[PDB]
Each structure stands twice: as C-alpha cells, then as structure tokens.
Amino acid sequence: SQVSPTRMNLLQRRGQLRLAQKGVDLLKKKRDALVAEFFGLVREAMEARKALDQAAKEAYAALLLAQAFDGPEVVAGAALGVPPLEGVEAEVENVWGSKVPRLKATFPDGALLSPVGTPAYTLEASRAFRRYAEALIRVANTETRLKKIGEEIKKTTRRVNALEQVVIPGIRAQIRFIQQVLEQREREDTFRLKRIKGKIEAREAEEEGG
Amino acid sequence: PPIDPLPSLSRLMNNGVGKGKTREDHKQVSDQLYSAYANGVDIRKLVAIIGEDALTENDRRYLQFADAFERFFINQGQQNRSIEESLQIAWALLSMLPQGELKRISKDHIGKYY
Numbered sequence: 171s172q173v174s175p176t177r178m179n180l181l182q183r184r185g186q187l188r189l190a191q192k193g194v195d196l197l198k199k200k201r202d203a204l205v206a207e208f209f210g211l212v213r214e215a216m217e218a219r220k221a222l223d224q225a226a227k228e229a230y231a232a233l234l235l236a237q238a239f240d241g242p243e244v245v246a247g248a249a250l251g252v253p254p255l256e257g258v259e260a261e262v263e264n265v266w267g268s269k270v271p272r273l274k275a276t277f278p279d280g281a282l283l284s285p286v287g288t289p290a291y292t293l294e295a296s297r298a299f300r301r302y303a304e305a306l307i308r309v310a311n312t313e314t315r316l317k318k319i320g321e322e323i324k325k326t327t328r329r330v331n332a333l334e335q336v337v338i339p340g341i342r343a344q345i346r347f348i349q350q351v352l353e354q355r356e357r358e359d360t361f362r363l364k365r366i367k368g369k370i371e372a373r374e375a376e377e378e379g380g
Numbered sequence: 381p382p383i384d385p386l387p388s389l390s391r392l393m394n395n396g397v398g399k400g401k402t403r404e405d406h407k408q409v410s411d412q413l414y415s416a417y418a419n420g421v422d423i424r425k426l427v428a429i430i431g432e433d434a435l436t437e438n439d440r441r442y443l444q445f446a447d448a449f450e451r452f453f454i455n456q457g458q459q460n461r462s463i464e465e466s467l468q469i470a471w472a473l474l475s476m477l478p479q480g481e482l483k484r485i486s487k488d489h490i491g492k493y494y
Contacts, residue, residue: 324430324431327429327432328429330428331428332429
C-alpha cells in the first residue's frame with residue numbers, strides 16, 4: 171500500500187540520524203536545569219509556613235467562645251473583604267513546560283487598627299490576617315511551579331521511552347531495507363554482464379573456430 | 381533461561397495435549413498464562429507517556445503477574461521441573477489475579493485448582 175522507495179528516500183534517511191541524535195542530545199539538558207532549581211523553591215516554601223501558621227491561629231482559636239457575638243465587632247473595624255473576582259494579583263508568564271500562570275496573595279486586610287471589642291484578641295486576630303496572606307504566597311508559587319514541572323517530567327520520559335522503540339531502530343531499518351535492495355539489484359547486473367561477456371568471447375571464437 | 385512468549389507463536393497448542401494425554405488442566409492453563417503476562421507488560425509502555433503512571437487498582441494485579449512470571453517461573457537455572465510441578469504452581473501466581481476477571485480458562489477448572 172504505502173512502501174518506501176529506495177533511491178529517492180536514501181538521502182533523507184541518512185540525514186535523519188544526523189538530525190535526530192543531535193537534537194535529542196541538548197533536549198536532554200534543557201529540562202535538567204529547571205528541576206535542579208525547583209528543589210530550592212519547594213524546601214524554602216515551608217520555612218515561612220511553619221512560622222506564620224501557628225501565630226495566625228494563636229489568636230483565632232482563642233477567639234471562638236468570646237466571639238460568636240464579637241464576630242460583628244471584629245469584622246467592622248477591620249478592612250472590608252478581599253474581592254471575590256481577582257482579589258489576588260494574577261501574573262502571566264510564558265516559560266518552558268508550557269504557559270503556566272502564577273500569582274501572589276497580597277491584598278489589604280489591615281492590622282492593629284480595629285476600634286472597640288476584646289482588649290487583646292480583637293487587634294491580635296486582625297494582625298493575623300497578614301500571616302495568611304504573606305504565608306500563602308509561598309504555596310502560590312510552588313503549586314503553580316508544580317504544574318509546570320509536571321509538563322517537563324512527562325515530555326522528558328515520553329521522548330526517551332519512545333526513541334528507544336519506534337523511532338531510533340526504525341530510522342535504522344529504513345537504511346538497512348534500502349541498502350539490501352540496492353545491493354541485491356546488483357546480482358542482475360553481474361549476471362547480465364556475465365552473459366554479455368559470453369557473447370563477446372563467443373564472437374572472437376568464430377574467427378578462430380566454431 | 382530467558383524465554384519471552386509474547387513474540388512467540390506456535391503451530392499446535394491443543395494437539396498432543398488434552399485431558400489424560402498430558403494433564404487435564406494442561407490444555408486449560410495454556411492460553412491462560414499467555415494473555416495474563418500480556419496485559420502486564422502492556423502497562424509498562426504507557427506509564428512513561430502520561431504522568432509516571434498509567435494504572436488503576438484493576439491493572440495493579442496484572443502488574444505483579446509480570447513480576448511473578450519473571451524470576452520465579454521463567455528463571456529456574458537448569459533445574460528439571462516436572463509436568464506436575466510446572467502447572468501446579470502456575471496456579472499460585474494466578475491467585476493474584478481476580479478469578480472473576482478470568483475469561484481464558486473454564487470455571488470447572490477453577491474449582492479443581494484455585
């Protein structure tokens with residue numbers, strides 16, 4: 171049905187190996203860079219997280235049975251709610267491992283400025299909102315980085331896997347198949363040329379005999 | 381010995397064999413081993429292609445059968461196994477696959493060796 175020609179195809183399939191092997195060489199160290207730096211961000215992430223998780227909650231959990239009627243008061247003095255449509259600051263960024271968007275969680279929420287209410291807890295709960303915001307930026311960058319480094323990792327293992335099967339020995343067997351048929355064609359050459367020789371000698375053998 | 385049966389294909393597989401001409405379950409355990417390994421090695425293709433996986437929990441059992449058939453069965457050194465010893469223990473690796481997901485072996489033989 172669809173079968174490869176020998177003479178036309180030859181030159182394409184020899185440069186096929188040149189093109190492939192070199193391309194894949196550098197393709198290799200292309201993602202390697204990006205994963206080495208990625209360890210750096212995942213580790214560093216949680217640094218602020220242990221510190222500020224606990225000092226947020228410090229006041230929160232100590233303002234639940236002194237709240238549920240001082241809930242009103244606390245929300246009043248403080249800076250009103252973050253917008254539900256893009257209260258966060260979304261950033262777009264094109265990078266290898268496809269176009270993945272990032273973002274940083276910084277918005278207003280105030281701190282140490284609610285008037286009236288519980289002496290300590292009110293103000294301490296308001297201040298705590300910062301320790302959500304700030305802390306959240308770390309996870310804001312690593313969970314979006316996670317989706318980028320997903321793309322790379324998967325495409326990487328894909329190419330290796332693929333290459334060692336369909337591609338590489340296939341781009342081989344093409345030269346081989348070609349070769350062998352070019353070669354074998356030249357049996358008929360020699361056989362014909364043989365019989366040609368036989369004629370020639372047979373002709374000069376009628377001058378001197380029969 | 382390294383024998384891979386997946387590119388292997390024989391001419392007869394129910395001739396010179398049958399109930400009492402070899403063992404009653406020889407004929408049964410033939411086709412069984414074949415499609416069982418198959419569905420193991422198959423997965424190990426598709427894992428690279430997407431994520432680091434390509435399996436559920438109903439794939440994970442056929443998965444261990446490609447390890448099980450491996451160094452336990454295929455490998456043996458040069459030790460002589462008997463026609464008994466072969467199929468007998470071939471049913472201890474077939475305990476790891478669900479018996480309700482077997483379709484290449486008959487049910488009356490499930491009750492003879494489990």
